[PDB]
Ligand binder design. Structure first.
Ligand SMILES: CN1C(=O)NS(=O)(=O)c2ccccc21
Ligand SMILES: [Zn+2]
Length: 257
């Protein structure tokens, strides 16, 4: 099965998922000097005030904080998007060391981690239908650098010991994802894909320019998670990031000068 090891990592994924070599794969390097300011891009609208978190799950590749997406409660709109996209889950990608971990890069710079807030286009009715469409998902990507702690991340960090291994889940209600956002919503945007198999080319990527700061202690606790299940040999959940993929015939647009 696919993963992030030497024998099943990103360079192998194309054998089971040929779209891995497709025309709009993610992540990508964001060349800040080549990204063009697009004055027709609108400000992002992130409306998370009624968000209903439910559960946190170790799925063997990351941990997902899942939300109730059966109603328009936490939605992303505006920016490059047409229509309304409902928050379904967030997760992170991170490194074994502070010098790597992000999926997107900025002028080849790798951040310590990257948060993905995953939303699906309500015009397709559910997430499974949305991923079959070129405009089915909108993922808000936020870089993490190591410095001061992020207070709004700590509730996530403190439950991780209860979902150490693949397949474990825990109740995770009343979590407010507004506490994970930076001050500015300036962003880059481009058409791309899921960054894990099945690598479907269904994502409008919206990557915020401003990173959030998290503490060394916070990210160290991410790195104590396991890819393996309980009672299997321990393999630390680290370096669960796909490297940058060819940009091909795409333009990255900036919302800001
Ligand atoms: N796998 C990821 O690792 N990063 S992502 O592209 O935000 C994502 C979005 C939805 C489904 C699978 C996902
Ligand atoms: Zn992701």
């Amino acid at each position: 099965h696919w993963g992030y090891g030497k024998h099943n990592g990103p360079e192998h994924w194309h054998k089971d998922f040929p779209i891995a070599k497709g025309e709009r794969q993610s992540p990508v390097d964001i060349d800040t000097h080549t990204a063009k300011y697009d004055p027709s891009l609108k400000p992002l609208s992130v409306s998370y005030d009624q968000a209903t978190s439910l559960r946190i799950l170790n799925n063997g590749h990351a941990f997902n904080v899942e939300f109730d997406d059966s109603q328009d409660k936490a939605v992303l709109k505006g920016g490059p998007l047409d229509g309304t996209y409902r928050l379904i889950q967030f997760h992170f990608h991170w490194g074994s060391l502070d010098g790597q971990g992000s999926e997107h890069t900025v002028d080849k710079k790798k951040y310590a981690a990257e948060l993905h807030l995953v939303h699906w286009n309500t015009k397709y009715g559910d997430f499974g239908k949305a991923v079959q469409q070129p405009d089915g998902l909108a993922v808000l990507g936020i870089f993490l650098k190591v410095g001061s702690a992020k207070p709004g991340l700590q509730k996530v960090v403190d439950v991780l010991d209860s979902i150490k291994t693949k397949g474990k889940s825990a109740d995770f209600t009343n979590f407010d994802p507004r506490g994970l956002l930076p001050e500015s919503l300036d962003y880059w945007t481009y058409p791309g894909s899921l960054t894990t198999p099945p690598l479907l080319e269904c994502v409008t990527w919206i990557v915020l320019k401003e990173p959030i700061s998290v503490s060394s202690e916070q990210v160290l606790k991410f790195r104590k998670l396991n890819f393996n299940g309980e009672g299997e040999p321990e393999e630390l959940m680290v370096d669960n990031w796909r490297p940058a993929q060819p940009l091909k015939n795409r333009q990255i647009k900036a919302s800001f000068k």
